[PDB]
Design a protein around this ligand. Structure first.
Ligand SMILES: N#CC[C@H](C1CCCC1)n1cc(-c2ncnc3[nH]ccc23)cn1
Ligand SMILES: N#CC[C@H](C1CCCC1)n1cc(-c2ncnc3[nH]ccc23)cn1
Lengths: 273, 266
């Protein structure tokens, strides 16, 4: 391949591997056609070795992907473990990621925004029912599934940081823009860090900028805003948005974790029907 | 950055890796030698941004067998960590230069590592990446040598079973592979694997290039061999301790305290 992975003959036999559609650290995603059926799939190639000497490391993503199926979550079709790399065959999603879509159309209507939150809150409710926290919910990790109808669903991917919650966690991880206060505070966190992330994304969908923005002074500013957690809906940007939307986003972006909506409560809110 | 260039004369790279470089630096005012760790956060040739966990832990820990954090300068591009300098290189390099060590030198090194671990476990911190590459050789004036635990990238506070599958296969505990819940004692298993390598020069659980599942099944069953002629010289004491460190039963497996109370490290 372009990057220089030695593609196993087992893979090349079954699949024709196409162009790269997703790039990360120690992982690439490619288009690929199954030779028998002519059906299009996503091939995710994960490097186990760091390629920094023989610094062989272990992957956690596939433990999670095996035990989950949902319309609004990326689907693992099968896996090929090779000494060098882990190869995941997954359902292909052709509409790109939510980050790309937001940069293309600054804002979204409440109708389009609620539909996307309905999809994301559905994925999160399912994961949470299995005590799985994602810990990396962000636009770059939400894939746009385009229906023939013209309608668009979101599919959640990148379960790299996903784990099972059996009591409070303390690992400091995620993207600062989307990270919950209790992660920064290091007082312990669980499933509801995902609700916070979803609240931040919903806010961005409606106005085109995040609720907590850093400064050129320092990065401690962004973290100070998140810890304070005062959500503002400034004019003129939020003038023509409903109170209902503002209410829901508020309930998702509460520092008090017991008061912060669960995924069930988001889904029961009138703004998502 | 200017602010760092002012205080510190940054010398050569002494440690390299993914998203991180460690360089020798000297504080100009005091002529004091330090290690400068530069952690790039973006690492995506783009606007992508990620948070750093190592620093939360380093702030909490002070121990003679743990690398000491002196100060942190958070520039928007990268994070800078000034840390205690250890000039003796990593234990991996040390093992590759000296095939195997005497029992006395090995028990010495396990004393240092079990001391670090005991300290961390008393603060409910699991390290989760204990391996030769992450152990630094402190060279005393006497010419005696200590170990210092270096990288806390995967380190966290434990309040109930963890499930995240992480670490290096050679040193990974069976409960991590089994996905049944793990805690502090994954560090004891790692320490057992290292002790075994120190005495014979090879790991107790060895993989087939053809099948790495042979490695994991060995780990899962705790199939520890003490083969001849390699282990002919080594005492029953060393073999018995390693045995208690590499037990699959987490409840039976030695704590850091129990390792330290073992005659072989006394
Ligand atoms: N989500 C997310 C981020 C992820 C990148 C990060 C690591 C590999 C690429 N990614 C997955 C895809 C992707 N695109 C299209 N179909 C897909 N199916 C499964 C993953 C996938 C693209 N980027
Ligand atoms: N331990 C460990 C692994 C780590 C590497 C992995 C991330 C940066 C380099 N590393 C730290 C050092 C090091 N060497 C000498 N003095 C030091 N002080 C603090 C870290 C350090 C060398 N490699």
């Amino acid at each position: 391949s372009e990057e220089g992975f030695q593609i196993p003959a087992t893979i090349t036999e079954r699949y024709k591997v196409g162009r790269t559609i997703g790039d990360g650290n120690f992982a690439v995603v490619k288009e690929c056609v199954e030779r028998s059926t002519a059906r299009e799939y996503a091939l995710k190639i994960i490097k186990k070795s760091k390629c920094r000497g023989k610094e062989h490391m272990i992957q956690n993503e596939v433990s999670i992907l095996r035990r989950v199926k949902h319309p609004n979550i990326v689907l693992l079709i099968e896996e090929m473990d090779v000494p060098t790399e882990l190869y995941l065959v997954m359902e292909l999603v052709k509409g790109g990621d939510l980050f790309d879509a937001i940069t293309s159309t600054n804002k979204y209507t409440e109708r389009d925004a609620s539909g996307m939150l309905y999809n994301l809150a559905s994925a999160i409710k399912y994961l949470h029912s299995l005590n799985i926290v994602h810990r990396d919910i962000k636009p770059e990790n939400l894939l746009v599934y385009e229906h023939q109808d013209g309608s668009k669903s979101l599919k959640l991917g990148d379960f790299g940081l996903a784990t099972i919650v059996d009591g409070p966690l303390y690992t400091v991880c995620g993207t600062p823009t989307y990270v919950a206060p209790e992660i920064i505070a290091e007082t312990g966190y669980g499933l509801k860090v995902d609700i916070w992330a979803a609240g931040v994304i919903t806010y961005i969908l409606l106005c085109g900028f995040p609720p907590f923005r850093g400064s050129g002074d320092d990065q401690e500013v962004l973290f100070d805003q998140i810890l304070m957690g005062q959500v503002d809906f400034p004019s003129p940007y939020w003038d023509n948005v409903s109170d209902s939307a503002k209410e829901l986003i508020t309930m998702m972006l509460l520092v008090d974790v017991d008061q912060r909506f669960s995924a069930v409560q988001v889904l029961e809110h009138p703004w998502v029907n």
